[PDB]
Amino acid sequence: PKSMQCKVILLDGSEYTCDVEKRSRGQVLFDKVCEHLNLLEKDYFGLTYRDAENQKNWLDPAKEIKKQVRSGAWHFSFNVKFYPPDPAQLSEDITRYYLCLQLRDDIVSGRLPCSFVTLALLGSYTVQSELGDYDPDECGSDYISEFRFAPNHTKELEDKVIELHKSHRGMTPAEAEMHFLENAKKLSMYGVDLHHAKDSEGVEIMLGVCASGLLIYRDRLRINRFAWPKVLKISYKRNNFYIKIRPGEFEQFESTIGFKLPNHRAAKRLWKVCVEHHTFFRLL
Ligand SMILES: COc1ccc(C)cc1NC(=O)Nn1cnnc1
């Protein structure tokens, strides 16, 4: 049996290295990573790889790893795929812990926009979790945390994190992580996966996929929202992605909204993440 070396970037930024048989399907590697992480509530998560065009792709657990990575290295990241709308209802604190780590990266990367005050508040809960109670021995007037909190750090952001950290005395890591999640879940882009596209007139839009449904970000004004029940069907053909929307009651026929993606693979990628979001959050 010939085995291939796999490298996985974990949500703490560490590397996990393991072997799988070269013909292995994605589920084999995922199960090894989740066992390494002591994770039981696994199906919120997944593995990503970067394709020949440098796009993020989800590793399909039903398909051979080699038929997905194809010409690329067997290098993956462990990520949240399906962001729970109500993290309090997760059964395990370790699940919430990994979800916090993902959201911290979503924030630092700028995928999850966040006000100044909420950046500082989330940062303060992270510090309480990682370091425990505020200690003025480590923190002077000139303190800057090792923790990345934001896409752009400023001294006043660092100061606000400390001021808020002082308020959290006695809070345990699990408590701080639950407060982090109860704040982060309210952000308008929480768990929204964004895809570049053009509308039927050729205007550049972003299509957002999340638990609640589909979002069409045309500009700061005119955000179109389709809750999953309103979405009758989704399809792709060539570089085109199509959403069928149910008619109001007493309407005869569903409406079709068409989008142009950069290429055929971007259209398939969007269709699949939409189907998967429909599939796991039809149930959950
Ligand atoms: C109950 O599990 C599901 C249900 C629906 C869907 C869409 C997915 C899963 N899980 C899943 O794919 N787990 N996994 C394996 N490798 N990466 C992630």
mmCIF file of C-alpha atoms and ligand atoms in Angstrom:
data_model
loop_
_atom_site.group_PDB
_atom_site.id
_atom_site.type_symbol
_atom_site.label_atom_id
_atom_site.label_comp_id
_atom_site.label_asym_id
_atom_site.label_seq_id
_atom_site.Cartn_x
_atom_site.Cartn_y
_atom_site.Cartn_z
ATOM 1 C CA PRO A 1 0.000 0.000 0.000
ATOM 2 C CA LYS A 2 1.570 3.309 -1.132
ATOM 3 C CA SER A 3 0.906 6.199 1.307
ATOM 4 C CA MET A 4 0.972 9.985 0.621
ATOM 5 C CA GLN A 5 2.080 12.533 3.206
ATOM 6 C CA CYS A 6 -0.645 15.097 4.106
ATOM 7 C CA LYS A 7 0.064 18.496 5.731
ATOM 8 C CA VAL A 8 -2.879 20.288 7.461
ATOM 9 C CA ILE A 9 -2.807 23.861 8.779
ATOM 10 C CA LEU A 10 -4.832 23.742 12.025
ATOM 11 C CA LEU A 11 -6.876 26.701 13.252
ATOM 12 C CA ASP A 12 -4.148 27.582 15.842
ATOM 13 C CA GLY A 13 -1.702 28.053 12.865
ATOM 14 C CA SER A 14 0.136 24.783 13.748
ATOM 15 C CA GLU A 15 0.846 21.996 11.147
ATOM 16 C CA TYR A 16 -0.514 18.412 11.468
ATOM 17 C CA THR A 17 1.324 15.826 9.330
ATOM 18 C CA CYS A 18 -0.094 12.340 8.648
ATOM 19 C CA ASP A 19 -0.138 9.659 5.951
ATOM 20 C CA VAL A 20 -3.052 8.145 4.064
ATOM 21 C CA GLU A 21 -3.107 5.459 1.335
ATOM 22 C CA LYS A 22 -2.714 7.258 -2.043
ATOM 23 C CA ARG A 23 -6.262 6.182 -3.212
ATOM 24 C CA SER A 24 -7.874 7.475 0.072
ATOM 25 C CA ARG A 25 -11.070 9.555 -0.045
ATOM 26 C CA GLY A 26 -11.260 12.854 1.773
ATOM 27 C CA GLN A 27 -13.258 11.423 4.709
ATOM 28 C CA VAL A 28 -10.139 9.324 5.735
ATOM 29 C CA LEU A 29 -7.928 12.422 6.161
ATOM 30 C CA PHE A 30 -10.786 14.414 7.796
ATOM 31 C CA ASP A 31 -11.394 11.623 10.362
ATOM 32 C CA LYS A 32 -7.626 11.586 11.196
ATOM 33 C CA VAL A 33 -7.554 15.402 11.633
ATOM 34 C CA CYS A 34 -10.755 15.425 13.799
ATOM 35 C CA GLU A 35 -9.395 12.571 15.991
ATOM 36 C CA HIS A 36 -6.126 14.609 16.434
ATOM 37 C CA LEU A 37 -8.259 17.628 17.452
ATOM 38 C CA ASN A 38 -10.441 15.552 19.908
ATOM 39 C CA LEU A 39 -13.446 16.849 17.893
ATOM 40 C CA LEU A 40 -16.791 14.939 17.985
ATOM 41 C CA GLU A 41 -19.138 17.556 16.411
ATOM 42 C CA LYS A 42 -17.180 17.151 13.187
ATOM 43 C CA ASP A 43 -19.716 17.910 10.426
ATOM 44 C CA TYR A 44 -19.628 21.731 10.967
ATOM 45 C CA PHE A 45 -15.999 21.543 9.671
ATOM 46 C CA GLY A 46 -14.067 20.427 6.611
ATOM 47 C CA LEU A 47 -10.724 20.617 4.825
ATOM 48 C CA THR A 48 -9.795 23.153 2.141
ATOM 49 C CA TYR A 49 -7.042 22.976 -0.468
ATOM 50 C CA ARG A 50 -5.830 25.523 -3.071
ATOM 51 C CA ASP A 51 -6.267 24.525 -6.759
ATOM 52 C CA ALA A 52 -4.093 25.198 -9.845
ATOM 53 C CA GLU A 53 -5.867 28.650 -10.169
ATOM 54 C CA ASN A 54 -5.094 29.267 -6.379
ATOM 55 C CA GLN A 55 -8.870 29.073 -5.485
ATOM 56 C CA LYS A 56 -10.021 27.635 -2.083
ATOM 57 C CA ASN A 57 -11.858 24.347 -2.635
ATOM 58 C CA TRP A 58 -13.483 22.060 -0.084
ATOM 59 C CA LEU A 59 -12.068 18.507 -0.021
ATOM 60 C CA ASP A 60 -15.055 16.304 -0.921
ATOM 61 C CA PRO A 61 -15.059 13.433 1.615
ATOM 62 C CA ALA A 62 -16.733 11.024 -0.910
ATOM 63 C CA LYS A 63 -14.056 11.512 -3.599
ATOM 64 C CA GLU A 64 -10.411 10.410 -3.872
ATOM 65 C CA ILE A 65 -8.012 13.088 -2.557
ATOM 66 C CA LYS A 66 -5.805 12.569 -5.641
ATOM 67 C CA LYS A 67 -8.733 13.336 -8.051
ATOM 68 C CA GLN A 68 -9.224 16.713 -6.281
ATOM 69 C CA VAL A 69 -5.687 18.004 -5.499
ATOM 70 C CA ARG A 70 -4.745 16.614 -8.978
ATOM 71 C CA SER A 71 -1.429 18.329 -9.856
ATOM 72 C CA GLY A 72 -1.096 20.218 -6.497
ATOM 73 C CA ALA A 73 0.622 19.428 -3.180
ATOM 74 C CA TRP A 74 -1.305 17.465 -0.487
ATOM 75 C CA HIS A 75 -1.548 20.610 1.638
ATOM 76 C CA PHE A 76 -4.845 21.404 3.402
ATOM 77 C CA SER A 77 -6.379 23.702 6.012
ATOM 78 C CA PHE A 78 -8.902 22.706 8.693
ATOM 79 C CA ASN A 79 -11.858 25.198 8.571
ATOM 80 C CA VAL A 80 -15.431 25.754 9.642
ATOM 81 C CA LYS A 81 -17.711 25.031 6.681
ATOM 82 C CA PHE A 82 -21.183 25.415 8.226
ATOM 83 C CA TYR A 83 -21.237 28.177 10.838
ATOM 84 C CA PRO A 84 -23.879 27.352 13.472
ATOM 85 C CA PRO A 85 -26.480 30.162 13.794
ATOM 86 C CA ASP A 86 -26.700 29.305 17.544
ATOM 87 C CA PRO A 87 -23.329 28.197 18.888
ATOM 88 C CA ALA A 88 -24.860 27.894 22.426
ATOM 89 C CA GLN A 89 -26.695 24.775 21.125
ATOM 90 C CA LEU A 90 -23.419 22.957 20.226
ATOM 91 C CA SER A 91 -23.020 20.023 22.648
ATOM 92 C CA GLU A 92 -19.278 20.501 23.377
ATOM 93 C CA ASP A 93 -17.053 23.359 24.534
ATOM 94 C CA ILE A 94 -14.203 22.089 22.283
ATOM 95 C CA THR A 95 -16.478 22.610 19.242
ATOM 96 C CA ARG A 96 -17.053 26.255 20.343
ATOM 97 C CA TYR A 97 -13.272 26.622 20.912
ATOM 98 C CA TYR A 98 -12.463 25.715 17.267
ATOM 99 C CA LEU A 99 -15.323 27.915 16.008
ATOM 100 C CA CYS A 100 -13.750 30.862 17.959
ATOM 101 C CA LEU A 101 -10.351 30.178 16.342
ATOM 102 C CA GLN A 102 -11.939 30.235 12.854
ATOM 103 C CA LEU A 103 -13.824 33.459 13.586
ATOM 104 C CA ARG A 104 -10.645 35.089 14.952
ATOM 105 C CA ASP A 105 -9.075 34.432 11.525
ATOM 106 C CA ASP A 106 -12.247 35.588 9.713
ATOM 107 C CA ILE A 107 -11.896 38.864 11.647
ATOM 108 C CA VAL A 108 -8.081 39.387 11.247
ATOM 109 C CA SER A 109 -8.338 38.545 7.480
ATOM 110 C CA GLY A 110 -11.216 41.078 6.975
ATOM 111 C CA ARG A 111 -13.683 38.388 5.698
ATOM 112 C CA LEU A 112 -15.821 39.282 8.759
ATOM 113 C CA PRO A 113 -16.173 43.077 9.043
ATOM 114 C CA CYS A 114 -16.555 44.314 12.625
ATOM 115 C CA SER A 115 -16.978 47.729 14.331
ATOM 116 C CA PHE A 116 -14.181 49.134 16.505
ATOM 117 C CA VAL A 117 -15.992 48.432 19.761
ATOM 118 C CA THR A 118 -16.967 44.837 18.819
ATOM 119 C CA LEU A 119 -13.353 44.198 17.621
ATOM 120 C CA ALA A 120 -12.143 45.280 21.099
ATOM 121 C CA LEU A 121 -14.901 43.302 22.886
ATOM 122 C CA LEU A 122 -14.177 40.075 20.953
ATOM 123 C CA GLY A 123 -10.447 40.659 21.509
ATOM 124 C CA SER A 124 -11.094 41.070 25.291
ATOM 125 C CA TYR A 125 -12.919 37.668 25.447
ATOM 126 C CA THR A 126 -10.073 36.007 23.506
ATOM 127 C CA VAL A 127 -7.556 37.424 26.002
ATOM 128 C CA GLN A 128 -9.674 36.299 28.994
ATOM 129 C CA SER A 129 -9.834 32.734 27.478
ATOM 130 C CA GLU A 130 -6.095 32.530 26.590
ATOM 131 C CA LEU A 131 -4.547 34.380 29.601
ATOM 132 C CA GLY A 132 -7.300 34.374 32.286
ATOM 133 C CA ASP A 133 -7.858 37.403 34.551
ATOM 134 C CA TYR A 134 -6.415 40.880 33.809
ATOM 135 C CA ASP A 135 -2.886 41.261 35.305
ATOM 136 C CA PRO A 136 -1.315 44.780 35.410
ATOM 137 C CA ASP A 137 2.163 43.101 35.826
ATOM 138 C CA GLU A 138 2.207 42.089 32.095
ATOM 139 C CA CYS A 139 0.272 45.191 30.868
ATOM 140 C CA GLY A 140 1.692 48.742 31.172
ATOM 141 C CA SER A 141 0.389 51.951 29.462
ATOM 142 C CA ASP A 142 2.531 50.861 26.416
ATOM 143 C CA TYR A 143 1.097 47.250 26.160
ATOM 144 C CA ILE A 144 0.529 45.604 22.710
ATOM 145 C CA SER A 145 -0.910 42.028 22.777
ATOM 146 C CA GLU A 146 0.681 39.149 20.833
ATOM 147 C CA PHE A 147 -2.959 38.381 19.764
ATOM 148 C CA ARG A 148 -3.955 39.594 16.337
ATOM 149 C CA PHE A 149 -7.477 41.075 16.844
ATOM 150 C CA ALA A 150 -8.168 43.064 13.660
ATOM 151 C CA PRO A 151 -7.212 43.665 10.014
ATOM 152 C CA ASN A 152 -5.527 46.924 11.178
ATOM 153 C CA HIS A 153 -4.169 47.266 14.692
ATOM 154 C CA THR A 154 -4.070 50.660 16.463
ATOM 155 C CA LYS A 155 -2.893 51.586 20.006
ATOM 156 C CA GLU A 156 -6.478 52.636 21.034
ATOM 157 C CA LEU A 157 -7.815 49.212 19.853
ATOM 158 C CA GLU A 158 -5.125 47.600 22.086
ATOM 159 C CA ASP A 159 -6.144 49.947 24.945
ATOM 160 C CA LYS A 160 -9.887 49.153 24.525
ATOM 161 C CA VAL A 161 -9.157 45.350 24.599
ATOM 162 C CA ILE A 162 -7.355 45.895 27.932
ATOM 163 C CA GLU A 163 -10.113 48.139 29.383
ATOM 164 C CA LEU A 164 -12.752 45.514 28.467
ATOM 165 C CA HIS A 165 -10.467 42.623 29.660
ATOM 166 C CA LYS A 166 -10.528 44.198 33.156
ATOM 167 C CA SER A 167 -14.358 43.704 33.299
ATOM 168 C CA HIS A 168 -14.130 39.897 32.712
ATOM 169 C CA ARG A 169 -12.467 38.853 36.061
ATOM 170 C CA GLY A 170 -13.341 35.237 37.092
ATOM 171 C CA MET A 171 -14.589 34.291 33.606
ATOM 172 C CA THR A 172 -13.435 30.783 32.567
ATOM 173 C CA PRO A 173 -12.169 30.010 29.015
ATOM 174 C CA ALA A 174 -15.470 28.246 28.089
ATOM 175 C CA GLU A 175 -17.467 31.234 29.450
ATOM 176 C CA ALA A 176 -15.267 33.770 27.541
ATOM 177 C CA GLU A 177 -15.600 31.624 24.338
ATOM 178 C CA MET A 178 -19.398 31.481 24.710
ATOM 179 C CA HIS A 179 -19.505 35.343 25.102
ATOM 180 C CA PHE A 180 -17.221 35.697 22.061
ATOM 181 C CA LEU A 181 -19.652 33.561 19.988
ATOM 182 C CA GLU A 182 -22.830 35.284 21.320
ATOM 183 C CA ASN A 183 -21.358 38.600 20.032
ATOM 184 C CA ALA A 184 -19.710 37.281 16.790
ATOM 185 C CA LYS A 185 -22.881 35.452 15.643
ATOM 186 C CA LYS A 186 -24.693 38.836 15.362
ATOM 187 C CA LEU A 187 -22.260 40.318 12.815
ATOM 188 C CA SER A 188 -23.933 40.848 9.409
ATOM 189 C CA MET A 189 -21.307 38.683 7.551
ATOM 190 C CA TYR A 190 -21.113 35.896 10.218
ATOM 191 C CA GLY A 191 -20.665 32.595 8.335
ATOM 192 C CA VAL A 192 -21.234 34.297 4.908
ATOM 193 C CA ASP A 193 -19.148 32.710 2.112
ATOM 194 C CA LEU A 194 -18.654 35.410 -0.607
ATOM 195 C CA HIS A 195 -18.294 34.661 -4.345
ATOM 196 C CA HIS A 196 -17.452 37.338 -6.986
ATOM 197 C CA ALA A 197 -19.985 37.344 -9.894
ATOM 198 C CA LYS A 198 -21.632 39.620 -12.500
ATOM 199 C CA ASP A 199 -25.419 40.117 -12.708
ATOM 200 C CA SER A 200 -27.338 39.592 -16.041
ATOM 201 C CA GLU A 201 -26.450 43.239 -17.036
ATOM 202 C CA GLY A 202 -22.673 42.621 -16.434
ATOM 203 C CA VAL A 203 -22.482 44.656 -13.139
ATOM 204 C CA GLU A 204 -20.032 43.253 -10.509
ATOM 205 C CA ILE A 205 -21.907 41.794 -7.471
ATOM 206 C CA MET A 206 -21.048 39.403 -4.610
ATOM 207 C CA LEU A 207 -23.155 36.302 -3.923
ATOM 208 C CA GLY A 208 -23.180 35.345 -0.203
ATOM 209 C CA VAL A 209 -24.014 31.795 0.980
ATOM 210 C CA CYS A 210 -24.948 31.103 4.642
ATOM 211 C CA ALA A 211 -27.329 29.083 6.944
ATOM 212 C CA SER A 212 -30.317 31.446 6.346
ATOM 213 C CA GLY A 213 -30.072 31.510 2.539
ATOM 214 C CA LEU A 214 -28.566 33.430 -0.401
ATOM 215 C CA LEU A 215 -27.556 37.119 -0.395
ATOM 216 C CA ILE A 216 -26.909 39.330 -3.474
ATOM 217 C CA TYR A 217 -24.645 42.314 -2.496
ATOM 218 C CA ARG A 218 -25.236 44.776 -5.426
ATOM 219 C CA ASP A 219 -24.055 47.915 -3.493
ATOM 220 C CA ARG A 220 -24.297 49.398 0.074
ATOM 221 C CA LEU A 221 -28.015 49.904 -0.868
ATOM 222 C CA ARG A 222 -30.001 47.110 -2.638
ATOM 223 C CA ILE A 223 -29.069 43.879 -0.748
ATOM 224 C CA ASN A 224 -31.318 41.053 -2.082
ATOM 225 C CA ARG A 225 -31.942 38.213 0.458
ATOM 226 C CA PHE A 226 -33.483 34.810 -0.473
ATOM 227 C CA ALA A 227 -34.264 32.622 2.599
ATOM 228 C CA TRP A 228 -33.777 28.930 1.691
ATOM 229 C CA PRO A 229 -37.612 28.311 1.533
ATOM 230 C CA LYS A 230 -37.871 30.954 -1.293
ATOM 231 C CA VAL A 231 -35.123 29.124 -3.328
ATOM 232 C CA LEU A 232 -36.851 26.477 -5.472
ATOM 233 C CA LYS A 233 -33.689 25.289 -7.314
ATOM 234 C CA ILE A 234 -30.018 26.186 -8.115
ATOM 235 C CA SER A 235 -28.025 25.182 -11.256
ATOM 236 C CA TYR A 236 -24.843 25.956 -13.197
ATOM 237 C CA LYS A 237 -24.076 25.704 -16.916
ATOM 238 C CA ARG A 238 -20.756 26.889 -18.446
ATOM 239 C CA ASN A 239 -19.770 30.016 -16.355
ATOM 240 C CA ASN A 240 -23.412 30.691 -15.436
ATOM 241 C CA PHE A 241 -25.097 30.200 -12.088
ATOM 242 C CA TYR A 242 -28.935 30.336 -11.852
ATOM 243 C CA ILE A 243 -31.257 30.737 -8.882
ATOM 244 C CA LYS A 244 -34.984 29.940 -9.281
ATOM 245 C CA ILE A 245 -37.102 31.997 -6.775
ATOM 246 C CA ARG A 246 -40.676 30.844 -5.861
ATOM 247 C CA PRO A 247 -43.552 33.116 -6.917
ATOM 248 C CA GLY A 248 -45.558 34.872 -4.183
ATOM 249 C CA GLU A 249 -48.849 33.051 -3.426
ATOM 250 C CA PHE A 250 -51.208 33.475 -6.472
ATOM 251 C CA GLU A 251 -48.166 34.012 -8.783
ATOM 252 C CA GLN A 252 -48.163 31.517 -11.714
ATOM 253 C CA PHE A 253 -44.354 31.021 -12.235
ATOM 254 C CA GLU A 254 -41.027 31.169 -10.316
ATOM 255 C CA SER A 255 -38.498 33.878 -11.418
ATOM 256 C CA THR A 256 -34.925 33.076 -12.636
ATOM 257 C CA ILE A 257 -31.931 35.220 -11.625
ATOM 258 C CA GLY A 258 -28.745 34.501 -13.625
ATOM 259 C CA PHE A 259 -25.125 35.316 -12.744
ATOM 260 C CA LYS A 260 -21.865 35.137 -14.736
ATOM 261 C CA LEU A 261 -18.935 33.630 -12.765
ATOM 262 C CA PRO A 262 -15.253 34.045 -13.795
ATOM 263 C CA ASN A 263 -15.082 30.466 -15.208
ATOM 264 C CA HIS A 264 -16.831 27.083 -15.154
ATOM 265 C CA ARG A 265 -14.981 25.924 -11.960
ATOM 266 C CA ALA A 266 -16.126 29.092 -10.033
ATOM 267 C CA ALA A 267 -19.753 28.380 -11.081
ATOM 268 C CA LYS A 268 -19.523 24.695 -9.994
ATOM 269 C CA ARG A 269 -17.811 25.746 -6.687
ATOM 270 C CA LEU A 270 -20.645 28.187 -5.894
ATOM 271 C CA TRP A 271 -23.408 25.642 -6.854
ATOM 272 C CA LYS A 272 -21.812 22.981 -4.580
ATOM 273 C CA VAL A 273 -21.407 25.258 -1.490
ATOM 274 C CA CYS A 274 -25.045 26.421 -2.046
ATOM 275 C CA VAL A 275 -26.370 22.820 -2.318
ATOM 276 C CA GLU A 276 -24.290 21.802 0.784
ATOM 277 C CA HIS A 277 -25.586 24.833 2.813
ATOM 278 C CA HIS A 278 -29.152 23.913 1.725
ATOM 279 C CA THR A 279 -28.521 20.184 2.562
ATOM 280 C CA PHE A 280 -27.039 20.401 6.132
ATOM 281 C CA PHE A 281 -29.261 23.396 7.224
ATOM 282 C CA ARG A 282 -32.499 21.985 5.794
ATOM 283 C CA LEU A 283 -32.063 19.593 8.808
ATOM 284 C CA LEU A 284 -30.087 21.664 11.399
HETATM 285 C C1 LIG B 1 -23.520 14.665 8.695
HETATM 286 O O1 LIG B 1 -22.520 15.080 7.746
HETATM 287 C C2 LIG B 1 -22.837 15.874 6.662
HETATM 288 C C3 LIG B 1 -24.096 16.212 6.206
HETATM 289 C C4 LIG B 1 -24.232 17.047 5.141
HETATM 290 C C5 LIG B 1 -23.099 17.573 4.487
HETATM 291 C C6 LIG B 1 -23.173 18.503 3.356
HETATM 292 C C7 LIG B 1 -21.849 17.243 4.915
HETATM 293 C C8 LIG B 1 -21.686 16.383 6.006
HETATM 294 N N1 LIG B 1 -20.424 16.088 6.566
HETATM 295 C C9 LIG B 1 -19.208 16.181 5.915
HETATM 296 O O2 LIG B 1 -19.025 16.397 4.733
HETATM 297 N N2 LIG B 1 -18.171 15.918 6.823
HETATM 298 N N3 LIG B 1 -16.914 16.135 6.295
HETATM 299 C C10 LIG B 1 -16.102 15.155 5.796
HETATM 300 N N4 LIG B 1 -14.992 15.758 5.268
HETATM 301 N N5 LIG B 1 -15.102 17.121 5.445
HETATM 302 C C11 LIG B 1 -16.259 17.375 6.062
#
